[PDB]
Amino acid sequence: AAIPDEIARQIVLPEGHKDNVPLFEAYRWLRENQPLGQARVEGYDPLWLITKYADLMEVERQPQIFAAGGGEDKGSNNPILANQAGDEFTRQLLGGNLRILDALPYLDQPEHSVVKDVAFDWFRPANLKKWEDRIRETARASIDRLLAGGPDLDAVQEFAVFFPLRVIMSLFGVPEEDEPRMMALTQDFFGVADPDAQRDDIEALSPDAAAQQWAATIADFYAYFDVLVESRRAEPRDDLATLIAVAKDENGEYFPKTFAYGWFVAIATAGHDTTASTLAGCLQSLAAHPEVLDRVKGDPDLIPDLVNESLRIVSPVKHFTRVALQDYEMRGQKIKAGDRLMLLFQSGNRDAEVFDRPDDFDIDRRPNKHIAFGYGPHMCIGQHLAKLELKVMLQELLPHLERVEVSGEPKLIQTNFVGGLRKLPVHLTFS
Ligand code: HEM
Ligand SMILES: Cc1ccc(Br)cc1
Secondary structure (H helix, E strand, O other): OOOOHHHHHHHHOHHHHOOHHHHHHHHHHHHHHOOEEEEOOOOOOOEEEEOOHHHHHHHHOOOOOEEOOOOOOOOOOOOOOOOHHHHHHHHHHHOOOOOOOOOHHHOOOOHHHHHHOOOOOOOOHHHHHHHHHHHHHHHHHHHHHHHHOOOEEEOHHHHHOHHHHHHHHHHHOOOHHHHHHHHHHHHHHHOOOOOOOOOOOOOOOOOOHHHHHHHHHHHHHHHHHHHHHHHHHHOOOOOHHHHHHOOEOOOOOEOOHHHHHHHHHHHHHHHHHHHHHHHHHHHHHHHHOHHHHHHHHHOHHHHHHHHHHHHHHHOOEOOOEEEEOOOEEEOOEEEOOOOEEEEOHHHHOOOOOOOOOOOOOOOOOOOOOOOOOOOOOOOOOOHHHHHHHHHHHHHHHHHHEEEEEEOOOOEEOOOOOEOOEEEOEEEEEEO
């Protein structure tokens, strides 16, 4: 049978994600009772909810069967779940398809492979070591401002958001004065279904509102990035904007400018927001588990373990969607050609078949098998940058902290997509 309606709504609807407790209880109910079922929520396409760690790997390692963008019918699948009204809006705007960005999530092989190779080497761990000292100087400046502002603050909007944004804008060559605009458009981009993040220029109550907001935000990013692409093509610099802007195909022709725009939208949004969420989530967990803060201050080599467990618990990127290009049997179910799948990374990260006491915050999982970056050819390109920035910031910050207390109500972004904390009121005790 279909998944029961309120479990299905809890996971599919953005409102279902407002509060982590009921959301994670819905993922757990599925993993234990209906690990591979079809959600049939009014206003959405039917979705196979991929809740199990092994099933996430099985789907993601088979891109010839489970496409992101629809295969040769490019743009026939939206890799980021919109409602039906929203996909209809986008098909009206684009003329029959859903490929609203030329960013990696929308691409299938071999196009995905050619485009990804423009930046694959830049993002490898050995090629990121050259940025470690700049990252550390940015962390130290951020910590100097935290110490100067006193013990009481929102650890998200008054601390965690700024460091990853500065790091990524510095690695582009985007001037510091443009950070507020990039932050505002990122809130519009990941807030399409959040009641406190609605743009003024869209009909907020329309059935397609989130899709209108997505499109409006992309158009603003395009206007900003068209100037940066033209600037770096005319005057190349030693920065990531130039690598993207001047990229040429195998025939010596620039990739179309929208491909550079796609890289820029992804790096200007996911490039900072996910790291901010994970840092804020880590601080929240150190407040719940003060013994972990004591241990990591005692042994700074535990910092990468703390990062890995923060990534598993926070898992801020909640899903991408796939479409079956042929019928496929998995876990005793018959997925049909054309059926859509929702990859629930947060649920894979609580799978008791893989993680002992999966809801516990345990930095001593070695190895820490989390799937917070996904899997397969679409696996997060930024993962090594995120792990470096989180390591560097914790190495600099934790010596300055004796204790984190949460002093007010945490708030999450209401999204089924790229979520995590927007507010974490704290009282810090400095060492
Ligand atoms: C804590 C930090 C982050 C987490 C948890 C995260 C998570 C993810 C996840 C789950 C995916 C989808 C993988 C899949 O489809 O199997 C993804 C894709 C992606 N992420 Fe990350 N991300 C983070 C940081 C970053 C950073 C720092 C950047 C860039 C500077 C970045 C850029 C991307 C891009 C471009 C994609 C699309 C890859 C593709 O479709 O091939 N991410 N990320
Ligand atoms: C996680 C993520 C990557 C690329 C885009 Br575009 C949006 C979100």
